[PDB]
Design a protein around this nucleic acid. Structure first.
Lengths: 125, 124, 170, 187, 106
RNA sequence: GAAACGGAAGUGUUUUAUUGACUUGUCCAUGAAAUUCCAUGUGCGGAAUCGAAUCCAUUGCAUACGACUUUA
RNA sequence: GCGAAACCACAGCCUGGGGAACGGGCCAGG
RNA sequence: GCAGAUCUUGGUGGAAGUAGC
RNA sequence: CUGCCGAAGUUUCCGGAUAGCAGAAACUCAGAUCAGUUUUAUGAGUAUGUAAAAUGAGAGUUUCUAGUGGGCCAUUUUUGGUAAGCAGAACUGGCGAUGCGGGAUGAACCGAACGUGAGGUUAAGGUGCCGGAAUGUACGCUC
């Protein structure tokens, strides 16, 4: 096993209005609800259900029931931001978001560069 | 006020297709147990006053004119003031000689004729 | 023949006033736009100016072969591609009369209408090509300066497998 | 989401009722559906449960045992088979045991709404259709359970060849500078 | 040949109906890619067509079309209600329809 | 022109030898239009032919009759 | 070879249910 | 002013080329 | 042939006289009355009744003049019960003169009562497929 519901483990919200926002579990209300919080101001401290989040592989040490400001201090100290981003999971998610933002002209450009890339076709005999 | 028909199908008498002795002219069913009189589901419709058509567009042909029956040249001249409202319809028993006279007169009056080509030939 | 011979059902005074068409904010002059219908469907063209309802549109005739044309604003997709410089070219000559089809006069005799001895053709005059060349000359440097845009207008837009227009942005 | 002309479904681990209802709706939607590995379907309930259900069915008709004939019967009951629309929809379904040669070289999809691992609670007894069929009359279980390894070995060899071939372009991808020069578009 | 198809694929599922009464004047259309009633708001008012071929080469062509428009969404899964110029035949259940991008508000 | 592989219903996976082209890999020059605002060999009926089958020489092996099995 | 008559609302494969037979005629199936 | 009255008169069917002579 | 009105289906004596229901005529009458309604308080015994408030509707008539003089589904209150069911009164409405959505199908169950249509929105029921509609969300029981 690599993902255990634990105090301090970083989770990714996949349902609700805060979809795609990182958060860290601070307390376990029950087997169906967990108290999470994120240092960024756009994510208020709240209780979320386990079915609305996915469990990440990053564990960062927090005291039980830590307040919002101290969570941010630990988050900055343990550089969770740019640690999650280093993993290929976040890079795939960020690329998907960037690719969704491409307009028609950008899509035409991508087709041109990917054709310039594909015409490489160099393989050793 | 374009012509609107609430219904175009006719009202056929119930069981008129089953029996050749029964005509298709509408007859109001009188049987109490008959499902057509009780107006069940899937059964044939019945003539109701709600099916009646607009008074302004009633009796009007699809071109907006009302058919006026004509038997001689006197009847055609009657539509001098109503050529935008009425179309001349020559009767079926008017001979081909009178039909010609009616058709030339209606042409000068600017009156549409519904059956202006009947019983005649053309020669240009 | 002048005094009305019938009831003369004169229409009641209708309180309808003609007011200018409010086009979309994305259909500005100079924005690259995708044609949706007509013989030039799928082409990408530059919006010179907005007529009363239509957009006086043209692709550079040396690029995609779309002449000075009108397009209804409903049959066009306003893409977010970088805008072209179109303020230079005067567009006052493009009015509804400029694009209006020639009215029927038909000077003939009843000797050549029979035998079809008329052959009436109204091929595009030289001034229309001159206007197209003038617009092309004033537009080509603008599309040449910004990269990847000259052949972008030459390409034809199309939908591939998995394309969801309600999700894709243009 | 989107439809293909022919959809091949690998019925391994799919519940009988959940897959049949999805397939029947797709058949009525105007699609040709091929279901392979029909002997690997799962039914909720213990072995004895559906055993008595099928034994009672034998008491009742043309009793069919083959796993595809079981699945074909389940799909048919979810179709308006008394009308021309239902019959036409039925003819677009091709259910077979195993993966025949025309289909083992084609991509096979799965139905998440019918998968056992996502619908049945862990620790619940289940009865495989192929095993259930083997004792009620079906006699080709052993030979199809032996041929699958031959198909798997050939398919595994194909995947290794494809993966080895892909490694060349994958290495050549990062080799080309233009891959990262204009990778700001997310590609 | 992937330089065409300015339209979106769709399927003619059925008419609007209750359990036992059908209303052929309005048809239920499943636009592919549209998976909810909020995404069905993009395709409202768009022209939809049914394209079929008939034996006679009338008009010097082998193809004829029935046009229509998308009126409102149907249900929660992204199906829409379409009214065609001529009511779609009942034989076209499960057939393919084309949803253009015009009249466009994009 | 090909050789290999593919048996579960292989009917397709490659390997190519060349012979020609497009080569969007990229940079230019021409042509597009008054469509001047959407409408989009195959089948039948005849013959001259080649085989096969039945009836047929038949037969009871079959048998109300049909129909069946052998042999001219 | 000659040559009827009775009879005739109309079709016609089964298992269950449709409460008033429901059946053959409805509903659900084979 | 008809669909009925085991309605009246006339014509004609399926049974049926059946029972049969 | 179409349109409009439209029952009773039962008190009382006793085949009827009735009454009552439904229409026609002759009236007068809002500064007036009427009501399958609720009241105020006290009269009597929460119910019951009272005269005069709220709400709605204009009402009261006189004359004669067609049709009916049953039942069923039963509910509820209710008496006797009697192995136990069940039977007996009244009451209540409906069906009976009533199509429609649902109830798998359905003479009496849940909605709803009807001119011909377009659009919208619902009721009762429902949204795995047959079958129009979430293989929706959250919390539990069961294999």
């Amino acid at each position: 096993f690599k993902r255990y519901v634990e105090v301090g483990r970083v989770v990714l919200v996949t349902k609700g209005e805060y979809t795609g926002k990182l958060a860290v579990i601070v307390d376990i209300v029950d087997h169906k609800r967990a108290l999470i919080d994120s240092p960024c101001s756009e994510f208020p401290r709240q209780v979320i259900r386990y079915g609305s989040v996915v469990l990440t592989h990053i564990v960062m040490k927090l005291p039980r029931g830590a307040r919002s400001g101290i969570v941010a201090k630990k988050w900055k100290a343990q550089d969770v931001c740019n640690k999650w981003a280093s993993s290929a999971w976040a890079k795939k998610l960020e690329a998907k978001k960037v690719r969704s933002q491409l307009n028609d002209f950008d899509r035409f450009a991508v087709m041109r560069l990917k054709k310039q890339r594909r015409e490489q076709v160099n393989v050793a005999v | 006020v374009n012509i609107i028909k609430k219904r175009t199908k006719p009202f056929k008498r119930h069981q008129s297709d089953r029996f050749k002795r029964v005509g298709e002219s509408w007859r109001k069913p009188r049987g109490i147990d008959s499902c057509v009189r009780r107006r069940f589901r899937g059964t044939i419709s019945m003539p109701k006053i709600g099916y009646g058509n607009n008074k302004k567009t009633r009796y009007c042909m699809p071109n907006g004119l009302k058919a006026f029956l004509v038997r001689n040249v006197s009847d055609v001249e009657l539509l001098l003031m109503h050529n935008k409202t009425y179309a001349a319809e020559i009767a079926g028993n008017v001979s081909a000689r009178k039909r010609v006279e009616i058709v030339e007169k209606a042409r000068a009056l600017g009156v549409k004729v519904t059956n202006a080509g009947a019983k005649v030939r053309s020669q240009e | 023949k002048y005094y009305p011979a019938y009831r003369e059902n004169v229409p009641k005074k209708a309180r309808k006033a003609v007011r200018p068409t409010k086009l979309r904010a994305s259909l500005a002059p100079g924005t690259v736009c995708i044609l949706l219908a007509g013989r030039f469907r799928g082409k990408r063209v530059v919006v010179l100016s907005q007529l009363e309802d239509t957009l006086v549109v043209t692709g550079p005739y040396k690029v995609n072969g779309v002449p000075i044309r009108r397009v209804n604003h409903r049959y066009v997709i306003a893409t977010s591609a970088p805008k072209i410089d179109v303020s230079g070219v005067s567009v006052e000559k493009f009015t509804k009369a400029y694009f209006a089809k020639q009215k029927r006069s038909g000077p003939v005799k009843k000797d050549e209408a029979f035998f079809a001895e008329n052959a009436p053709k109204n091929a595009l005059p030289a001034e229309r090509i001159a206007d197209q060349k003038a617009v092309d000359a004033k537009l080509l440097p603008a599309i040449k300066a910004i990269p990847n845009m000259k052949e972008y207008l030459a390409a034809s837009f199309a939908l591939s497998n998995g394309d969801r227009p309600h999700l894709m942005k243009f | 989401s989107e439809f293909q002309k022919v959809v091949v479904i690998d019925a391994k681990g799919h519940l009988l009722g959940r897959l049949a209802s999805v397939v029947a709706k797709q058949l009525l939607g105007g699609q040709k559906v091929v279901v392979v590995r029909c002997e690997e379907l799962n039914i909720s309930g213990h072995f004895f449960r559906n055993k008595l259900k099928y034994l009672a069915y034998l008491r009742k008709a043309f009793h069919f045992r083959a796993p595809s004939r079981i699945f074909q019967k389940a799909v048919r009951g979810m179709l308006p088979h008394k009308t021309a629309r239902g019959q036409a929809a039925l003819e677009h379904l091709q259910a077979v045991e195993g993966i025949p040669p025309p289909f083992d070289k084609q991509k096979r999809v799965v139905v998440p709404a019918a998968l056992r691992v996502l619908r049945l609670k862990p620790g619940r007894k289940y009865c495989t259709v192929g095993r259930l069929s083997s004792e009620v009359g079906w006699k080709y279980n052993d030979i199809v359970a032996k041929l699958e390894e031959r198909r798997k070995v050939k398919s595994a060899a194909f995947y290794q060849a494809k993966l080895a071939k892909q490694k060349k372009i994958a290495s050549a991808k990062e080799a080309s500078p233009v891959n990262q020069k204009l990778s700001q578009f997310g590609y | 040949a992937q330089g065409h198809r300015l339209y979106v694929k769709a399927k003619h599922l059925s008419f609007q109906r209750s359990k036992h009464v059908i209303h052929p004047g309005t048809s239920i259309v499943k636009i592919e890619g549209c998976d909810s009633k909020e995404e069905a708001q993009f395709y409202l008012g768009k022209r939809v067509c049914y394209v079929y071929k008939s034996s006679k080469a009338v008009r010097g062509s082998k193809i004829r079309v029935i046009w229509g428009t998308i009126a409102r969404p149907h249900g929660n899964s992204g199906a829409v209600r379409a009214r065609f110029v001529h009511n779609l035949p009942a034989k076209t259940f499960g057939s393919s329809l084309r949803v253009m991008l015009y009249p466009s508000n994009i």
